[PDB]
């Protein structure tokens, strides 16, 4: 006879899809940096990975809860980092600016003299400072008597220069009883079954760069540059491209800016651009042709696989932010043309750039900042690792802006969080005495 | 020998008097209201499933510390929720005012003040309507007024992105504890209960705030009920509870508009605009006979202890305390009650005043400025109790005492108790 009876196993390998928060881990002057001890366990390792066989799982980068979870965490800390910094309200005053009109006659710059409340709460002082034209708006057709570009909606904090902007690698860890599955296919799709899967306790190092129209320092495909979108037939949805061959980009400000400290109030300071040393020139980016051309030819070669004649078109127009590659070069926020790249159909090529100190930097309009200048020459090398593309519906693809969380979807597409259910019950011939 | 050995049982019905923190539960659009269900733990609205027999327990609602830890926690939540919206520090400026005047009524002032525009370089004189209760004099000639609270605190506006409308609140004990529920009809607070049950969480507790009356509150099953720590002494308030409630209607028949002022950088102060439509003082309705009847009831329970009874107007104090103050429609009220407790043993009007600046609690270190709600206001609620006091030919008057006595009208039945699941007794059994 069969003589089968219930048997309980504790610790069988089965998992269930679930949503939970992952505590942050990171690599290694007080308060140091944005990713300091305030939020993450410092300088923990990049530990082993658990290999799996004969397992199949269906991940979904667009329904993944890690992306939505992470976006609010970036905002929460970035708001926390700027809590103690000075509120820039006392700077709201009419500025007696005039043309820069100073040799070592630059375009896009101004010289402004404005009143200030000094250390004492009495007596003015005619302090002065340079200002980029993008951070300042004229009040009269005459042109004189300028005003800051942000004071009418909401005055916002200065970024304290003592805390660094650098995006040190970050690792996300699951709590005990939960596991982070990882897909490993060479040509993963972003949706559907993974025939090759693994799992790890903490994710690999994400470098949380903030950028638009170009992902930098991000992950890379093994080969065969990949395409990822909610539905390629749809157009309003964003298309994320991740490269395989990185193309090097060098961005620089050749000028030697001096930092001027303005005692804007009792115990308060407002840093601003000072007198300029050395030769004077506009900033720019360097990206090598024959490598972007190979890169752009490639993606087009894999774009046409889902369109049975492809065209790359200039930015969508409108606000300077969404229309422009907007990244941070280690302490200053750069806005770079990009119209010279996305003009093609199927040596060096340079892009001129513009700096904006008064920035919002979120699609969420409930925040603002003032990034103080970085004295001295600044240059930052980087890899372009992905593109954002948008479609109107023979296709023309514009460099894409859109929602900010699309950047994080480029790094976290491999991962899914799964709840462990170790209890298992099955019949067996055994019988309790 | 008697051959007895110790026997241990896990799950025995034994419980111990205990004090511990509790966690909120509530019924099921962002930022909703101050009593946030997104701050509480929704948990479950229907625990039920209980019954008990043959148990007797001793309750003391006058020393039920469940209310005290709840008392402070409720203030902590309200204090916490006012963090994100503005401080009215810039509103402290000398106010030049004129009569409300025709286009002719009073109790308001056409007060104008200087305020900074988008740039510090430039300023503008705004104008608004303020109630006289929000303002005090500086020069006896009749101008250059001052705001009431500026010499004590920089007040916070009640920014309307989160409201005060109260939802029912269920109070749950943590794992390892239970709440004993005294279940009799005439259980007057203290002493041995004889019909008792328990439950994981209490029923819907209305977080109401009022003085001299209890609104939307609990009801005794039948026959009015009275509770007091002592009756011979007259120091502490006596709580009356009504099984037969009486409706109270309030109204502000004025289509008062809302005026926005750019008081600070990115901060929007709210002030009264022009009045539209007719003009009337705010007043409340309670029906004669319907209301007068309940005082004939309460007199019986007073004289069940005291060997005729008279009810008289408020004993005395500031306008904060000599009044029935309550919230209706989001705008606070401070009303009279002298037209009701004026009897010895058609709707009768209670005309009264509104305030924007409030403190409520005896603590003066915190202030709240409630902006006006556009349009006419009206609301209906159930009166279910009083907060009377003894004078000691013996009369009574409607007292308010400190705030926390409002809670005890809702928590008198509930006592939190720890569970001791283990018990040991001798038995003839033995380990093999």
């Amino acid at each position: 006879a069969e003589n089968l009876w219930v048997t309980v196993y504790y610790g069988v390998p089965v998992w269930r899809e679930a949503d939970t928060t992952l505590f942050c881990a990171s690599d290694a002057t007080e308060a140091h940096n944005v990713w300091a001890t305030h939020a993450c366990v410092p300088t923990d390792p990049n530990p082993q990975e658990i290999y799996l066989e004969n397992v199949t799982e269906n991940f979904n980068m667009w329904k993944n809860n890690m992306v939505e979870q992470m976006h609010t965490d970036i905002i929460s800390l970035w708001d926390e980092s700027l809590k103690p910094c000075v509120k820039l309200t006392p700077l709201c005053v009419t500025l007696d600016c005039q043309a820069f009109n100073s040799s070592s006659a630059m375009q896009e710059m101004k010289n402004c003299s404005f009143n200030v409340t000094t250390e004492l709460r009495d007596k003015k002082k005619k302090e002065y400072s340079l200002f980029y034209k993008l951070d300042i708006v004229q009040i009269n057709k005459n042109g004189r008597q300028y005003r800051l570009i942000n004071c009418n909606t909401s005055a916002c904090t200065q970024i304290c220069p003592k805390v660094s902007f650098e995006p040190i690698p970050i690792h996300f860890c699951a709590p005990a009883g939960f596991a982070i599955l990882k897909c490993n296919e060479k040509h993963f799709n972003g949706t559907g079954p993974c025939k090759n899967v693994s799992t790890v306790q903490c994710t690999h190092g994400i470098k949380p760069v903030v950028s638009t129209q170009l992902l930098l320092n991000g992950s890379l495909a093994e080969e065969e540059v990949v395409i990822r979108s909610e539905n390629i037939t749809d157009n309003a949805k964003t298309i994320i491209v991740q490269l395989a061959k990185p193309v090097k980009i060098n961005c620089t400000r050749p000028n030697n800016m001096t930092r001027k400290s303005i005692r804007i109030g009792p115990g308060q300071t407002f840093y601003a651009l000072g007198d300029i040393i050395g030769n004077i020139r506009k900033p720019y980016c360097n990206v090598s042709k024959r490598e972007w051309n190979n890169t752009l030819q490639q993606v087009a070669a894999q774009l046409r696989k889902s369109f049975n004649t492809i065209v790359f078109e200039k930015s969508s127009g409108g606000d300077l932010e969404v229309t422009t590659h907007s990244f941070n070069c280690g302490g200053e926020f750069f806005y770079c043309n990009t119209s010279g790249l996305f003009n093609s159909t199927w040596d060096t090529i340079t892009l001129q750039c513009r700096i904006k100190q008064i920035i919002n930097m979120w699609q969420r309009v409930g925040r603002c900042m003032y990034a103080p200048p970085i004295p001295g020459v600044i240059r930052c090398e980087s890899n372009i690792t992905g593109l954002l593309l948008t479609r109107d519906g023979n296709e023309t693809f514009r460099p894409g802006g859109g929602d900010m969380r699309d950047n994080w979807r480029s790094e976290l597409y491999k991962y899914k969080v799964v709840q462990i259910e170790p209890l298992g019950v099955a019949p067996t011939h055994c019988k309790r005495r | 020998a008697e051959n007895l050995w110790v026997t241990v049982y896990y799950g025995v019905p034994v419980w111990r008097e205990a004090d511990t923190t509790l966690f909120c539960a509530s019924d099921a659009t962002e930022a909703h209201n101050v009593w946030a269900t997104h701050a509480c733990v929704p948990t479950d609205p229907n625990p039920q499933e209980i019954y008990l027999e043959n148990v007797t327990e001793n309750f003391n609602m006058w020393k039920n510390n469940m209310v005290e830890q709840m008392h402070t926690d409720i203030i902590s939540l309200w204090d916490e929720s006012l963090k994100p919206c503005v401080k009215l520090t810039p509103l402290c400026v000398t106010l030049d005012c004129q009569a409300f005047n025709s286009s002719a009524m009073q109790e308001m002032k056409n007060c104008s003040f200087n305020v900074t525009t988008e740039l510090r370089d430039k300023k503008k004189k705004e104008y608004s309507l303020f109630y006289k209760l929000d303002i005090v004099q500086i020069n006896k000639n009749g101008r250059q007024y001052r705001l009431i609270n500026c010499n004590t605190s920089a007040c916070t506006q009640i920014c309307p992105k989160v409201s005060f409308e109260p939802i029912p609140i269920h109070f749950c004990a943590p794992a390892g504890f239970a709440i004993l529920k005294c279940n009799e009809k005439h259980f007057n607070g203290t002493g041995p209960c004889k019909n008792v049950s328990t439950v994981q969480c209490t029923h819907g507790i209305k977080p109401v705030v009022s003085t001299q009356l209890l609104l939307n509150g609990s009801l005794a099953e039948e026959e009015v009920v009275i509770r007091s720590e002592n009756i011979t002494d007259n120091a502490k308030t006596i709580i009356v509870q009504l099984a037969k409630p009486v409706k109270i209607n309030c109204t502000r028949p004025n289509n008062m508009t809302r005026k926005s002022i750019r008081i600070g950088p990115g901060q929007t102060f709210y002030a009264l605009g022009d009045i539209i439509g007719n003009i009337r003082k705010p007043y409340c309705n309670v029906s004669k006979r319907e209301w007068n009847n309940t005082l004939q009831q309460v007199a019986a329970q007073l004289r069940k202890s005291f060997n005729t009874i008279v009810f008289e107007k408020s004993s005395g104090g500031d306008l904060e305390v000599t009044t029935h103050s309550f919230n209706c429609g989001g705008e606070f009220f401070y009303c009279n009650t002298s037209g009701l407790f004026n009897s010895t043993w058609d709707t009768i009007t209670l005309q009264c005043r509104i305030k924007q600046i409030i403190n409520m609690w005896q603590r003066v270190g915190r202030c709240m400025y409630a902006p006006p709600i556009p349009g006419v206001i009206r609301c209906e609620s159930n009166i279910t109790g009083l907060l009377l006091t003894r004078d000691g030919n013996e009369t009574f008057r409607p007292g308010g005492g400190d705030m926390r006595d409002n809670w005890r009208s809702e928590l008198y039945k509930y006592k939190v108790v720890q569970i001791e699941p283990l018990g040991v007794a001798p038995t003839h059994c033995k380990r093999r």
Partner: antibody
Amino acid sequence: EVQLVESGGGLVQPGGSLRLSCTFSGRSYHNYGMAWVRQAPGKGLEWVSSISSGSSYTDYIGSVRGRFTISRENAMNSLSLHMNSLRAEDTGVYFCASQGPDPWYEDDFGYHYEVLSNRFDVWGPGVLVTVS
Amino acid sequence: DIQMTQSPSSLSASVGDRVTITCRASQTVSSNLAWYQQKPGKAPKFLIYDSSTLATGVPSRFSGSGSGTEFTLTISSLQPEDFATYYCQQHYSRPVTFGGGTKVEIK
């Protein structure tokens, strides 16, 4: 010196929306209130409306209340009277005039105020408006 | 409402003569009264404010009796550039209104 110009006036049928525009050819427009003054042929000047430098204290004469609309755009140094629902009795020359520059009462930090100080310091050449 | 009027309607004078123009108000205004000159074929010009203070560009032959309410404008000597229409206004409170105006002519 401060100088001004008007444009847009002409002849339009009754009940029209013949708008008027004034331009400010000078500095410091940020702190000038402005007004329009009407003048029927042979009759005295009649005040039409006024708008402060900050555009927060617009005011009108009762004879045109609810009809007229006065607006300005500091970003382009201009004053726009978006007049609507004209009638024949509105015929008469129109002058754009600027109130005196806002008072300066330095007490604590900088202090520019926003009165409608009703002194019409300078007048533009004027533009005709006729309705028939 | 502040009704305003001037008297007499017009006066006669010649170059070199002293001139006087009177302006009266029904309601009381402390000192907030001003005057204008309107040369025909041109928009008005600014003469006096606060009832005694001269304009920036006025040649100082003019003076205003800035006291009481019998406000009056006087010219020490008459010159042809002053031979034009005149207006008085109250700027105490809105709505603003100008009197009927007055004109000068040869004597």
